[model samples]
Target: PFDYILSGGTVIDGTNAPGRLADVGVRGDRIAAVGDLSASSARRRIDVAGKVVSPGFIDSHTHDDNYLLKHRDMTPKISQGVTTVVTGNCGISLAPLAHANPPAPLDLLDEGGSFRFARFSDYLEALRAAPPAVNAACMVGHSTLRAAVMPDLRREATADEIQAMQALADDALASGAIGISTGAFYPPAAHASTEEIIEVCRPLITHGGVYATHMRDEGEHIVQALEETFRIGRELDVPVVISHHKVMGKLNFGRSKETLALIEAAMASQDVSLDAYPYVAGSTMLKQDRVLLAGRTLITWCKPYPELSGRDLEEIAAERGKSKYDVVPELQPAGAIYFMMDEPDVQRILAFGPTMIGSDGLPHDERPHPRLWGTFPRVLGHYSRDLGLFPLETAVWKMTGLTAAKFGLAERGQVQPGYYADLVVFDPATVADSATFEHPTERAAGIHSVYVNGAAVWEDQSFTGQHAGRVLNR
Candidate 1:
């Protein structure tokens, strides 16, 4: 017998297949049956005629390690039909560190919790003890390990330090991490040579782990960065993910074609994949050099001048009678939005068959980007339905099935018998993002319901107060 029946919905099963009119039967936490379940009886039957029923979105990139525990309701995610989030992106996991005062970029998540989990297992255990509203596939942050092991970040890791980092890496995977991530683009990991990275990641070979990275550079040196990423994968003998892949500055605006060509060609010899958000603006820790390269900049958060958040960099410069370059020095330890990508390049990347959609959203920002609240819905409604970038099925697949395959979630990202009942029901036509750079906290429109582990988390536009999320591991 089924507990509930989602009757008469069009099922987009997350495999790029055409939607089929069917009914889904849920028994406990697994999908009991699919296809014409009208004859089957359940305790309750919800009619979902004229709606899309897809596997809940799997966020391919996120910084929600602390957000999951702090905001357990996960409104920004569940409101847009995301059931599971891939956390610990950009080499910034909140765990395995006990610093009362975390370093820059690590401070991105320091707003909520104390960096008190000394071991990677300690962090994962905290997650398990108090499960949040959505599932989390946590990855060990390379930067986190570096911060824990090294006394300083200005130079490469010594052999002894590399051994300590390797031990932590082993513990992270053994403690139930989905994979490993590196933010070589960030300040902490920037000094790490390719050899240092390879030596640190050697644990992945025997542990069945994947390598994901924010490469050392994304602009003029992108080719060299991509080559280094490829080399790391080759040496580690694992699949490599180019995290939030983008080109910065006007000089590199249209160069995604060139980069994608390189990525495509590299696939011939080794495993390589990528994820991108559907916006031209990118957010991260504030850097003075990036301010000049951006056509415009919006400070997401300013530690010294919290009130200046959401203000344009140029506007603040005009008010203070100083160059925007000078303003960055004043706002030490900040985050910003850099409008450095071209729209055509964004469209091209999002439309790629292998490219998955991830929000790359920073939840800790005071004035967060719209991608935090709006990524999945925007892709489903604006890009796929309105702009005709690709079919709805393709967009669904990119966030669901395709991402699952990449990250090795064998039981998820598909709506089939025996799969976990992480499902979403939404109006395909009206389901567009309501958030923007101006007011980014707005929830999406047209999503009817969301279920995690066959239990309702979102219904009637509010949380159901049921927390059935789990700590997922490979």
Candidate 2:
């Protein structure tokens, strides 16, 4: 008998095909069939009339490295129907190091939130020794590498130092890391020159891994930053993925078009891509706000407290008696909701043929990015149904197939016979992002059930408390 069967659900296979009414049969950890099945076939059967079934969501960008250690259940992602997550983003991972050298401030979390890594490889082994509740693949961070070899952060790397970082990247990729991620706006990566970035990314090209970057700048210099990104891809011959595509600063309000155009032009010549969330506001640490105010960096500013998390910065700054630039300092070390992109820009970028969806979710602030809890649902509700920005098939492809193709997760991002049975069922009409800046932890609306490896992980908004996740190795 089959392990379980869900009959009469509208199946949206992961290929971006139109949805169809069908029954899914699961046997062990794979889909047994995707057609009519008798009621007595399954050991346990679920009647899923009026539900939409698709491949379980794959969150492409996240910082759940240590998070999986603290909460093995990974309630945040799994509860939202994400069965797999790609972590160690923005050049902040904890692996592929030696005992003599230590971790830097960029290492996911330092002692007392500072930063330290006695050894990078040990950190990866720790995660493997005690895996988490969801499938996780990590990327070795550029900032972490800089911190390890050259913590000074002021000088560019020497040829020898660059080789060290490249060796680490090569070792990490061999150790099962998905790729090399760089946080260009952040320190270390910010200090590294374009040539340095290429040197560091050499291993990624050698390994056939993606080069995911936070980019050097996303403000007035977005075009130049994108050019630099493209140059890296061309020089190194590695796929490049820009994380959380956005334009900061008021002057760049409608710049998403230009940015998208740059990416399109580059892709036409060579392989380049990007991902974006489905919200107007951007969220990051209070420290990042400080970076903007000192004229040290460019960032949109929003008020703190009452405007915490969700409020738009442009409007909030007007009410708070400050310009977007002036108010940034006072909000130091606190989350600022920056209204960085225009509606036209956001809609246009989402419609890009190669763009994928990534939450860029950071789950540990008093006020976190809404993407943390609402990214998938918001795409379904706001963009897909409410605004008709893109079809459901397009959005799903961006979230699933596109990302899988990027990260080499060929087995996990689809729904087909012999594939891993990671699945989600929800009401297409009722799906909506409920989490706001004011209430960031609220679960999404309409996600009724979730499964990982043919095991029920969520039902009726309640987690099954089962630990069915595995550490995926590319």
Candidate 3:
């Protein structure tokens, strides 16, 4: 008997193909069948006669590592129809080193919880030993790698240290990491030059792993950053993934045209791709805002003034009794809006028809960026249903199949007979984002159920509280 049966839904299948009415059958931890299954019986059956059934969305960029460690339930991600999440982006992770005596500058949220392992093998062993609620994959973090070699903050690595870091990256990929991720804009990673980034990422390229980067600059230097990203992929012969690709600041608000033009050119020349959350604002740790706003004219902090999580910094600065420099600290206080892209740019970028959808959601925040709670639904509601930014098929492909193909997880991105049965059923017409600064945790509307590996983690507007998901590597 099948474990469960989803009957009478329009299955999108994650191929960017036209949806077809069909019955999807799940058994154990995989899809048992995907065709005419009217006669098939299961332990449970969901009559999703008027819904869209597709592969469970894979969050290509996220910082859920800390959240997952503390709360294994994975409520925020799963509730939003995410069955799999690729964590450890932006030079942060929970493995590949031991924090036997973590230093004073430890990330406040991570504290003693950043992944601790004596070696790559140890990290993999720990992952294997722990049973998680959502499919998790991670990259060898440049920050952690740098910290391992030089606890002090410095820009360049010594020759021996570079060689050591490269060796560590190689071992991490061999041990099962999907790739090497770096946040060039962040301190330790920012200190390293492009040459160094390529040197560290060489192991991933050789191992058929991807190179994901949060570029050095997302505002004025976006063009140069894009060029740098393309150059790395061209030189290394690996796919380059731009993390949470977007333009911020009002100065660069309508600059996506230039950014997309460059990316399109790069995509034509090299194996390049990018991901973006479907909201106007982006999120990150408190320290990140400080780095960008160090010499900037605008940008404000998001904390204490949580009401400004979604507002433009230029406007916020005017509202507050402060100059651009004075407000810069507040905008960037611990965490602030680094606005660079215009709303039209967001819609324009989505229209590219090839970019992937990434939440880039930081799990920690009292008044977090709404994208954390609303990215996917916002795409469905605002971009697709309202503005008609892209067709439903393309959006699904971006959020599911495209990401899987880029990340080497093809088996989980589609609804097929042999694929892992990670699925979501939602009513398209009514689906929309409900998360706002005032009500950030509000469940999105129209998503009726979510399944991870054939196990129903959420159904009928309620959580079943199952933990069948596991960490994925390579």
Candidate 4:
């Protein structure tokens, strides 16, 4: 007998295949059967006629490393049918650090006081002790290593510093981290030389770990950045993932064609993959240079002036009797949503063959980007169903099977026998993203049920208060 069963649902098996009417059975955290199970008995069974059953969405990129502990419920992700997240993105992780005051993007993960783990193993242990509601696959941050080893971050690391950072990365791999990520785009890692990054990430080649990077530039110099990323992967002989692939700034509005072409050319030689959110605007640290090109900007969070959250940068500047440029410097170490990418560019990238969908949401922001809540449903309903960009199966594949294969997540992204029962059920007709820039915290519309590791964690738009998540290790 199965623990639970769902009867008569249209199953999209996460393999980019067409849907078929099938019954799925679950027994103790694993899918027991996928065909006719009506004759079999179960502890509980639900009739799911007219509903879409699929493998639960995997948020391909996230910064939920600290949020998993602070907000264990993780409603923003779970409520949207996200069963797993790849955390420690953009070179900012909370572990293997010994800093009381972390720099810009590193602090984006957590403030100084939250850096409790001096070793990578300690962070993994804490996750195991009090797990979140969704599974997390972690990566060690290159910037975090620099912070731990070097006294100053403005310059490139010395021979000794590189050795120390490499040692930390090796330790993290042994402790079960899936990969190493670098944020060369941020100030802390901006000056990192290509050779320096290759040396720091050399540990991955030995451990069979991947190298993921937020490259040095995303605008005019994006092609150069792509070359740098490809070089590291080739030299290290490991897989590479280009985090949140985009062409930022108005001057580079329609460069996805060039970028994607380069990515495709590089794929012939080495393993390469990328993830993108479904929005034109991006949220990150408020730098004066970034603000200059932004057509419009909203303050996501401001440490120095907390009340300015959610306000427009232009309006705030006027109220403070200063230029937007001048006001930007005053809000030191802040976060903002920059209206940069074009709609055509976003759609073009989303439709790319190997691009997976990732929210890239900043969880700790006072007023976060709508991608935090609306990303998955928007892709399913608006883009796939409404706009006819692609079939619903393709959308599901990007978030599920394709992502799992790229990240080497075994048996978690398919609805098949012997696979973990991480699943979601939703009404296809009514599914849509309700969250928007004006009100960024609203829940999605049509996600009816969610299960993580065979436990029903969300149903009927409410949490079941079950912490069934596990800390996944590669």
Candidate 5:
């Protein structure tokens, strides 16, 4: 006897294979069967004649570290059919650093209220006690370690500091963290030399952890940054993931052609992987010099001026009779959306066969980038279904199988029999993101059902108040 069955659906099995007519029987938290199961006995049999059934999306990148603890419902992710998220991205994990007043990007995780986990295991234990709606795999941040170990951010770690960081890195992976991620792009890590990072992350070699990074520079010196990333991967003998690969600024626009070519050549000799969100604009801290490179900038959040959320930075500056550069410091500890990449570069990178789809969404931003709600569906509807960038199966593969394989998430990214029933069913015709820049928190259009561990977390366009999520380490 089966727990439940979907009688008729086109199964796009997350392997970049074409859809097939099949019925899926879910028993407990696993897909017990996937075939002609029309005669199977079940408590319920759903009629999904024209719907597309697929493995639930695995968000290849996210900043949902403390978010899982704070907002256990996980509305933004489950609504888009994202069953799992790789959190603690851009060198900003929350645990193992108990600080009441964390620095810039670490503060992005929690504004000092929830940085109480003094060890990596302490944080994972909290997740085990109260898991969110979607599964979470975490990576310890190099910047977070530097914050915890070093007294300042303006210099590279000394030998003593490197040992302290390595101790935490080893403990984190042992305590269930899947990898180590770095934001060499951020101030806390900008001064960290390549040798400092490699020394601090020595645990990756022993623990078989992945090395993921937001390179030190994305413009002009991007090649040098890429070489540095490759050097770290080669030295550690582990897989490497380039987080949110892009070329920022008009001076660097269309550089994806050159960057991707370099990446392609590098992959021939190393375990190189990369992810991209489907957008031309990127979001991050507001206190950066990149404001000068942006064609447009929208304030996502501001600590001092909450009412200015979602306003244009340029307009705000003009009203104040100043340059946007000079206005930035006034909005200290803020986040902004920068119009950075070009359409041609974005399309080309996303269409690249190996590029996985990651939202890179900041859940804490006041008026957050719409990628928080719309990333997966936008790829499905706009890029795959509408723009003809790739077939639906291909898009699904990028979000599911490719991401799972890259992240080493076992059994979670496929709809095969005996696999965990992290699945989604949606209307192919109407599946699109309703969320936009103006109204960023809106739900998607056509996602009908989202199941995590066979528990229906999302249905009828709302969360079912179920928290069947688990730590991937288990």
Candidate 6:
């Protein structure tokens, strides 16, 4: 007898293939069958007639390291049909941190008290004890290591400091971490030399771990950034994931064509893949210097001025009788949405063959970007169905199988016998994002049911409070 059977649904199967009518049988958290299982017996059956049943979406990028512990429900991700999230992007991880106060973007993950885990194993233990609603594949942060070992954040690390960071990376990878991530673009890691990064990531090759990076630059010097990224991957002989790929600044409006082309060329020799969010605006720490590059900017969160959470920087500046530059300093250690990317560039990157979809959402932001709640559905309902960007099957592949394969997530992100029963049932015609810039927290529309490890965590638009998620180690 099966645990449950989803009957009479069209299965997308996450392979970029056309949908087929099938019934999926689940037995002990594994998909037992994926054909005509009508004659088989089951403890429970869900009639998903006319619904699109596919592998549960994998949010390729996120910052839910601390949120996973604080709020195990993970309503923002699970409600939108995400069964897995790849955390520690942009070089910010919560664990393996020894410092009381982390640096700029690293602090974006959590504040003082949350950085209790001094070892990567400690973080994993916490997750095992109180698992979140979705699986997490973690990457150790280079910036966090810098803060942990280095006395100064503004310059190159000493040889001993480099060794300390490498030791941590080795331990993290050995202790179930998927990989090491570098945020060379962030201030804490800005002084990291190419040699230092290569040495730190040398352990990944032996551990079969991947190397993910928020490259040194995404704007005028993006080509150079791409070169640095490719160099590290090539030297280490490990798969490279370019996190939240995009071109910033007005001068770099149509530069994605160049960047993507360069990425394609690099792939000819080494293993390289990329992830991009569906929106044009990008969210990150509110640096005073970044205000000049933004065409428009909205403050996502402010530490000193909490009341100005959702206001535009320009408006805040006008009210304060100062330029946005002056106002930016007052909102130190803040976050903002910078409207710096071009629509065409965004679409082009999304449509690229090697590009996978990632929200890159900051879950803890008070006025979080709508991408946090709306990324997957927006791509499924708005871009695929309405805009005809690509076939719905292609969209499914980008978020599911392609992502899983790239990240080495074994037996997940597909609909087949012997695979984990992580799946989503949705109304294809109506599944769209309801969250907008002004109202960023609205739930998506038409996501009927979501299952992780064969347990229904979301059904009828409510969380079931089941924490079936696992910590995936490399």
Task: Write down the lDDT of every candidate, Cα atoms only.
Answer: 0.90, 0.74, 0.75, 0.90, 0.91, 0.90
Question: How many residue pairs clash (N, CA or C atoms closer than 3 angstroms) in each of the candidate models, in the order given?
Answer: 0, 9, 15, 0, 0, 0
* Candidate 2 weakest ten by summed lDDT: 294-303
Cα error, candidate 3, residue 407 (Å): 0.8
How well is each residue in 327-363 modelled by candidate 6, as lDDT tens digits? 7777888898888888999999999998999998888
Q: How do the residues 146-223 of candidate 2 rate in per-residue lDDT, one tens digit apiece?
A: 876775777889998999888888888877787888887775566799888889878877677889888888887778
Local accuracy of candidate 5 as per-residue lDDT tens digits, 308-377: 9989999999999988888888888889898878899999999998999999899989999999999999
lDDT of 4 by residue, 45-116 (tens): 889899999999999899999999888889999989999999888888888986777888777777448887
TM-score of each: 0.98, 0.88, 0.89, 0.98, 0.98, 0.98
Q: Evaluate model 4: give its lDDT.
A: 0.90
Predicted structure 5: clash tally: 0
Question: Could you tell me the C-alpha RMSD of candidate 1 in Å?
Answer: 1.2
Better of 5 and 6 by lDDT: 5
* Residue 322 lDDT in candidate 2: 83
Worst 10 residues of 6 by lDDT: 287-296
Instruction: For residues 113-169, write the lDDT of model 1, one tens digit per residue.
Output: 569899888887887888888899999899999999999998999999999998998
Global Cα lDDT for candidate 3: 0.75
lDDT of 2 at 295: 27
Model 5 residue 259 lDDT?
96
C-alpha RMSD for every candidate: 1.2, 4.2, 3.7, 1.2, 1.2, 1.1
Residue pairs clashing in model 5 are none
Evaluated at residue 284, the lDDT of candidate 4 is 86
